[PDB]
Design an enzyme around this catalytic site. Structure first.
Site, PDB file in Angstrom:
ATOM      1  N   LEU B  21       0.810  -1.147  -0.037  1.00 49.98           N
ATOM      2  CA  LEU B  21       0.070   0.022  -0.082  1.00 49.98           C
ATOM      3  C   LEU B  21       0.768   1.325  -0.095  1.00 49.98           C
ATOM      4  CD1 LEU B  21      -3.063  -0.980   2.189  1.00 49.98           C
ATOM      5  CD2 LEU B  21      -3.137  -0.328  -0.123  1.00 49.98           C
ATOM      6  N   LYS B  42       1.138  -3.772   9.014  1.00 48.20           N
ATOM      7  CA  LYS B  42       2.368  -2.970   8.919  1.00 48.20           C
ATOM      8  C   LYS B  42       3.426  -4.026   9.571  1.00 48.20           C
ATOM      9  CE  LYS B  42       4.006   1.414  10.971  1.00 48.20           C
ATOM     10  NZ  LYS B  42       3.643   2.499  11.623  1.00 48.20           N
ATOM     11  N   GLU B  90      -7.086  -1.728  10.655  1.00 48.32           N
ATOM     12  CA  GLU B  90      -8.077  -1.429   9.683  1.00 48.32           C
ATOM     13  C   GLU B  90      -7.620  -0.920   8.134  1.00 48.32           C
ATOM     14  OE1 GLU B  90     -10.652   1.162  12.092  1.00 48.32           O
ATOM     15  OE2 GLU B  90     -11.936  -0.601  12.525  1.00 48.32           O
ATOM     16  N   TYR B  91      -8.146  -1.526   7.103  1.00 41.95           N
ATOM     17  CA  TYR B  91      -8.208  -0.848   5.820  1.00 41.95           C
ATOM     18  C   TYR B  91      -9.125   0.254   5.426  1.00 41.95           C
ATOM     19  CZ  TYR B  91      -7.542  -1.221   0.736  1.00 41.95           C
ATOM     20  OH  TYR B  91      -7.249  -0.768  -0.761  1.00 41.95           O
ATOM     21  N   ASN B 144      -2.325  12.242   7.522  1.00 44.81           N
ATOM     22  CA  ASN B 144      -2.325  11.207   8.646  1.00 44.81           C
ATOM     23  C   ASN B 144      -3.812  10.889   8.949  1.00 44.81           C
ATOM     24  OD1 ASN B 144       0.300  10.725   9.052  1.00 44.81           O
ATOM     25  ND2 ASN B 144       0.403  12.767  10.141  1.00 44.81           N
ATOM     26  N   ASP B 157      -1.593   7.070  12.805  1.00 44.81           N
ATOM     27  CA  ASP B 157      -0.357   7.460  13.239  1.00 44.81           C
ATOM     28  C   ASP B 157      -0.296   8.254  14.592  1.00 44.81           C
ATOM     29  OD1 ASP B 157       1.171   6.466  11.173  1.00 44.81           O
ATOM     30  OD2 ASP B 157       2.260   8.276  10.862  1.00 44.81           O
TER      31      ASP B 157
HETATM   32  C1  0S8 Z   1      -0.490   1.155  11.337  1.00 43.46           C
HETATM   33  O1  0S8 Z   1      -1.755   2.106  10.472  1.00 43.46           O
HETATM   34  C2  0S8 Z   1      -0.910   2.135   9.263  1.00 43.46           C
HETATM   35  C3  0S8 Z   1      -2.208   2.554   8.209  1.00 43.46           C
HETATM   36  C4  0S8 Z   1      -2.809   1.497   7.828  1.00 43.46           C
HETATM   37  C5  0S8 Z   1      -3.698   1.591   6.560  1.00 43.46           C
HETATM   38  C6  0S8 Z   1      -3.516   2.357   5.398  1.00 43.46           C
HETATM   39  C7  0S8 Z   1      -4.605   2.159   4.568  1.00 43.46           C
HETATM   40  N1  0S8 Z   1      -4.566   2.431   3.213  1.00 43.46           N
HETATM   41  C8  0S8 Z   1      -3.402   3.058   2.434  1.00 43.46           C
HETATM   42  N2  0S8 Z   1      -2.171   3.237   2.980  1.00 43.46           N
HETATM   43  C9  0S8 Z   1      -1.315   3.728   2.252  1.00 43.46           C
HETATM   44  N3  0S8 Z   1       0.045   3.952   2.676  1.00 43.46           N
HETATM   45  C10 0S8 Z   1       0.617   3.350   3.979  1.00 43.46           C
HETATM   46  C11 0S8 Z   1       0.294   4.469   5.026  1.00 43.46           C
HETATM   47  C12 0S8 Z   1      -0.425   5.508   5.085  1.00 43.46           C
HETATM   48  C13 0S8 Z   1      -0.400   6.117   6.347  1.00 43.46           C
HETATM   49  C14 0S8 Z   1      -1.187   7.345   6.941  1.00 43.46           C
HETATM   50  N4  0S8 Z   1      -0.001   5.310   7.064  1.00 43.46           N
HETATM   51  O2  0S8 Z   1       0.473   4.350   6.438  1.00 43.46           O
HETATM   52  N5  0S8 Z   1      -1.417   3.900   0.952  1.00 43.46           N
HETATM   53  C15 0S8 Z   1      -2.656   4.086   0.579  1.00 43.46           C
HETATM   54  C16 0S8 Z   1      -3.799   3.254   1.038  1.00 43.46           C
HETATM   55 BR1  0S8 Z   1      -5.364   3.060   0.364  1.00 43.46          BR
HETATM   56  N6  0S8 Z   1      -5.381   1.656   5.061  1.00 43.46           N
HETATM   57  N7  0S8 Z   1      -4.915   1.547   6.569  1.00 43.46           N
END
Ligand code: 0S8
Ligand code: 0S8
Lengths: 272, 278
Positions: B21, B42, B90-91, B144, B157
């Site tokens: 991601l 993560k 969570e996504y 964030n 974060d």
């Molecule tokens: C431990 O928390 C990490 C965030 C979990 C998360 C990320 C997403 N969707 C997406 N994430 C990212 N990049 C990684 C990222 C962004 C942040 C702020 N932190 O980590 N790119 C695109 C997507 Br869609 N869902 N859950």
């Protein structure tokens, strides 16, 4: 010019008919004072007088003469600071020009943050009128900004410093009103002044706001090259913002002309 | 090594790892019985140190203590035994809020005034929850905040380990922007972080929402930023923003931290404004 200047009886005023008053402002080796002129028959007219400072050089004199001579060739218009006369003989050169009691448009706008949306468009209309006139007379300003528009007792807008002869010199940075071609390619046209009017428009609708606060020269270049464009002010129609954005076209030939801008602003004023 | 925690452990064979991601990867968790749920995971990169592991563990432990709220990225599980540490969370399918807003700028479907005020409300709710659990974010920005498929705002974060006496103010984000531009003066100059400095940063985030992902102080380098702040400079009102919501930003940017509204207050005000916004 070292011992005497040429006389121009069309414009020459007797020195006894001019009483110099309080200073209005100064610059590098020139300065401007409020004065009273009698019979430009026996009515006193409040005028502004531009003259050299005591530390001026021959080249400063030559600049000031050229400014006066350009004012002659350009002729009169209501929305420009007009030449009214000159003392050229038997002492220092006094270039006598119209007095605008309310000072520059930047200050004028800031002290009224009380103008209506119509008044603000009217200001913009008057400025473009002045510029449409100057451009018909082959005059490129090269520093059109609200700081170079003076306002009269009766709230008439009057372009100044149109006859004048270091990117880091400031307390704001003039490079922030320059077209990209003028800044990058040293191409100065009437269309490059259109870009500058774009920024003046923005100053107008932010009531004296400062373009790009905190942005130094190298960063501004960087913003320009990225095609960055200042955000629409609040209290500004989407039409006006597109006028600004239009003035800010990268290609000068696709920017509107002052003739076009006067037509639009005339329409816009009537519909505000 | 890692201590076992039965409250959170998912067997490794129940997690099907997918696309990166941006480290964080997309995955499917089987169970969490015969249902798969899309989740973000993560994990450490290859060149990671023991300090990086330590920081990932701390983030996970912090999530455990804080508990669940609709408007934060919630911990779902972990794989801690017999292999790489995976923290399962969570996504959010629609990505970060900055990008979400920029993609929806007019020329993807446009956001109403109410939709924008609703983003603000949800972020403030999440922050109010975090504040209630004694958590100070320290980098609250639209970047964030993540957005789910059903347009739910989730703060991210919030549990991160940071040494504040080692922040590089000159370090840009990947998008080309400088995190110092969201920091209360007292955090920036004095390294004093409070819920009140988070409220300052929320003011900047509100600005980001109403400019549809706008960049604060564009072209202003670090030294000039300091000088604007010392002079009491405040950003101009975005166009297409009520006086009432600009007053809110300005309130959040009060020079005296005690005089800023709380997230409790912001939550109540925004609730009221959401209901009256067209
Ligand atoms: C431990 O928390 C990490 C965030 C979990 C998360 C990320 C997403 N969707 C997406 N994430 C990212 N990049 C990684 C990222 C962004 C942040 C702020 N932190 O980590 N790119 C695109 C997507 Br869609 N869902 N859950
Ligand atoms: C050669 O004409 C220059 C403008 C003549 C003028 C000045 C004023 N009134 C005021 N002027 C100034 N500063 C002098 C100045 C400003 C600019 C631009 N150029 O010179 N300050 C206050 C006033 Br009120 N009327 N006409």
């Amino acid at each position: 010019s070292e011992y005497e200047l040429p006389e121009d009886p069309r414009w020459e005023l007797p020195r006894d008919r001019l009483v110099l008053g309080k200073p209005l402002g100064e610059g590098a080796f020139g300065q401007v004072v409020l004065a009273e002129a009698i019979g430009l028959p026996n009515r006193v007219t409040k005028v502004a007088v531009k003259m050299l400072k005591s530390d001026a050089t021959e080249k400063d004199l030559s600049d000031l003469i050229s400014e006066m001579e350009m004012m002659k060739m350009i002729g009169k218009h209501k929305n420009i600071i007009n030449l009214l006369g000159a003392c050229t003989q038997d002492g220092p050169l006094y270039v006598i020009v119209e007095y605008a009691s309310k000072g520059n448009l930047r200050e004028y706008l800031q002290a009224r943050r009380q103008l209506s949306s119509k008044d603000l468009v009217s200001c913009a209309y008057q400025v473009a009128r002045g510029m449409e006139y100057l451009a018909s007379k082959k005059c490129i300003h090269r520093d059109l900004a609200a700081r170079n528009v003076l306002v009269t007792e009766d709230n008439v807008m009057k372009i100044a410093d149109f006859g004048l002869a270091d990117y880091y010199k400031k307390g704001r940075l003039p490079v922030k009103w320059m077209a990209p071609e003028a800044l990058f390619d040293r191409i100065y046209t009437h269309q490059s002044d259109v870009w500058s009017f774009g920024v003046l428009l923005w100053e107008i609708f932010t009531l004296g706001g400062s373009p790009y606060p905190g942005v130094p020269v190298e960063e501004l270049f960087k913003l320009l090259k990225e095609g960055h464009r200042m955000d629409k002010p609040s209290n500004c129609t989407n039409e006006l913002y597109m006028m600004m954005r239009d003035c800010w076209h990268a290609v000068p030939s696709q920017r509107p002309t002052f003739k076009q801008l006067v037509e639009d602003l005339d329409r816009i004023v009537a519909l505000t």
